[PDB]
Point group: D2
């Protein structure tokens, strides 16, 4: 998996038939190599229709998700293995090449206490079996580290690496998010250096979830480190600029993040492509 990507939420929150087409056509109009397709309601996604659309527009894809609370692997690992295996099935039917995201828990998961060894044991056994199922399907399996307000289990790149190393599956990769690294990494580039050869997917996201290039992420440090470790994964723009006010509660966003999704695709995709070139990413 290598090239530039855009998250489908730049257009669509749902994945009905038309939403799928509008997002896929848009990502192709912006010359992306990948679209990242969110899986929120597994019954509702038509895998054959999505595969046809991708073929029409010469686009590749990865899927992402967040485990629903009944499937949180830290307490209910068997429900997680079922839900992730189900997700991997529809990913592989779609033509996607990986499932990534918060594949290990929730984005409002707290126990109130530091993460325990019994929790990390459930995670290890849950992710071990599903990545296995991913391997039988030829898919890769990602783990996105997120900030301490969303999850208590995987916050820093170091914790994601330690999880991957314990499972021992060569088809699991570490997935980092510049919005979350901005809070969690002691110097954002240190997240990328810790991940090193496990790092195969990035969410390139401004510090306010707006337009990359216009916030607090130290993009030179980020691209310095991706270049120095020889990064050859996917760089996917993640922004909240097209989120309606209804989505507020699910994403903890209470006021507009940018002027509009048009501005974010125009300027944010070109910024990521021009920084990639300055630092000879994929060179």
């Amino acid at each position: 998996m290598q090239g530039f990507g855009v998250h489908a939420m730049m257009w669509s929150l749902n994945w009905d038939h038309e939403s799928a087409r509008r997002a896929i056509a848009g990502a192709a109009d912006y010359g992306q190599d990948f679209i990242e397709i969110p899986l929120v309601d597994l019954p509702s996604v038509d895998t054959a229709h999505t595969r046809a659309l991708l073929e029409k527009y010469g686009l590749r894809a990865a899927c992402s998700l967040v485990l629903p609370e009944p499937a949180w692997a830290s307490v209910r690992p068997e429900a997680a293995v079922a839900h992730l295996n189900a997700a991997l099935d529809k990913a592989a039917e779609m033509g996607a090449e990986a499932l990534t995201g918060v594949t290990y828990g929730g984005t409002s998961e707290r126990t109130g206490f530091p993460p325990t060894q019994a929790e990390y044991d459930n995670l290890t056994r849950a992710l071990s079996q599903s990545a296995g199922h991913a391997k039988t399907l030829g898919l890769q399996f990602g783990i996105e580290a997120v900030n301490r307000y969303e999850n208590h289990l995987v916050n820093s790149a170091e914790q994601a690496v330690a999880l991957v190393e314990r499972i021992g599956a060569d088809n699991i990769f570490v997935h980092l998010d510049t919005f979350h690294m901005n809070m969690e990494e002691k110097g954002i580039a240190n997240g990328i250096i810790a991940a090193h050869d496990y790092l195969k997917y990035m969410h390139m996201s401004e510090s306010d979830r707006g337009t990359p290039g216009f916030g607090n992420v130290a993009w030179d440090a980020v691209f310095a480190a991706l270049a120095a470790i020889g990064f050859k994964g996917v760089l996917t723009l993640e922004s909240f600029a097209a989120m309606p006010e209804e989505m507020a509660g699910a994403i903890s966003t209470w006021r507009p993040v940018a002027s509009g999704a048009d501005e974010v695709l125009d300027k944010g995709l070109a910024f990521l492509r021009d920084k990639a070139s300055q630092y000879r990413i994929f060179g």
Copy 2:
């Protein structure tokens, strides 16, 4: 109020006789002008004792708090005023010069929706009552903007500024926190510039609540902005280095933030002092 401050959390977050002695003498060993005292249990504070220790060490003080849920001003403004007024009576007894912090709601407050006009009506009237009560005691009243995960009402400097102008008191100041601006401000210095008329207090906190100078906050942009608007207030360090594991739920940190408090105090107060000199912060 002008000068350098350190939050008492660097030595404890209880405020019994012993914790007060340890924190106040600690802040004096480090040549601070101010200590920031958190008011967590109003019936338990020995205000007279604190006052005598402050005079003994020649230390000045600000008080800060977070409103408990029964008193969140957005939904229960009468309860907010009764609590804020009692906290102000304690601050004045100790000899503090201001009450600041999350004085309008909680740090775990959500409605699931963006802030509505009736919630701001409630905030405006509750803070205008209590700012008046603070005025009768000779104290100033502060509003600290925090990030979207802790609160949905006052996130950006502009919001804080617009709320001050609505209340129309002359003893209310805006209070910014670089850890929170690192998420909420579209370029951190834009927060300081927006508040140029009302900014009188800063929390100088690193992007991970660790040691200032060793994270992702753009300190040169922060200090340039403080210098250019002619900042005339307090620069208080805030870090979670002294926080034991048992506090993890109340602060949502599940990983140590630094080596030890002694290191944060040593390295962080020196960094802030050196950046202050470089940018001529107090003349």
Copy 3:
């Protein structure tokens, strides 16, 4: 004198009838407010022609120069005055509103020693009289600080400020250059802050003379300081991407600075615009 500007060197430094139209038409095409016209060989300037082009394309102009060695003001102030007064004449005929740049010495000036009392007295007397000649014409007069390898007299913003105060003329402004500031200012924002009373003109130039936004200049600090001091003048793009190799010696530049002037124009101009909008530079 307010808005965005591009230096004519983006097209060519020659200013015959062909070069002026191309440069002025090019500057209009990119929506600029000002073009900076270099005055090099004075007798080859048709100024009525240039004034016609300007008012046809709706463009304003400032003129810039460097003193040639026999007119260096530190040692030959009378020759400085006559040369400056002659540049001011043709600048006025063109309808430019200001003459700026290294109006006080050379870009290869060096005595081997720190600048002396007597050298500054020569500068003062020379610029004092030429600034008065500019006043009768309606022109403003600028002093551009440059780095220690090009000049030994005006390197820092505070030097420029002290010189302007010394001269006592109300029509001289400080001109600063982000490329030179990157070497001379102890934290680039401190030059902008120090000049805050007299700063009316900027050279927005990347650290390698390439494309602004793709080097080592800390643009968030630059723009934060501009906004916070309430900057009102012109922001002019300076870059060497159009210079042929025969210019190498004249600009101490031994390798290409970028991959073409069209790229620097398209990407660099839009970067200065988006940054200005982010920090709300012009309201």
Copy 4:
């Protein structure tokens, strides 16, 4: 060679008996692994005295120089070889482990033209010769890139690496300077990344030659790239704070650079120590 170093110029540029003592005791007092010994006037450097001091204080050493004009290698390669070999003889006698710096030319060298093939031909043969002499003495040989105003031949790390690869000698390393990279590298970390195969020595110097951490150098990007390429080498502090006013012409510095070598050693070495530990520079 591996560890932290400091330039003897922080104490003196003369290397007589008491300056050698002053500087070596001084470096040892700040816990340095290395001291960099300038070689300027060869017949006055006592080698037995210097070697004895180094072993008493547990200090290792590198020597450095600039070629005097009669021996610039680009135009007089036989003369360069003589001067380099004699300097190498002194360095070996002192106990030093390498000769580095501007070993291919001068710091006010310029033809007025971009560098030519024939010039690089002379460098290649002269450096080939003397690096083989250095090999006979058990020394490595360094080449330091400097900025376009000091030298027209070796400005970017890329040029350094190409030269090193042409000569083909297993004891030549690349040596970079953050002060010079801040001008020459399009994004400062790109130079470190370009040299990843041959980078074994850094001058850690602020953008104004003052105190590292209080200027314009992007230290997070610098230390990140160093970490990510797995740097094993020397991080040597370089600053002009201790240099008398009579030395202005040699270093093109016309005004004070910081506030004294004392503050520069104290705060700068502290800043490099803390940055080095943040990014885990040596494991």
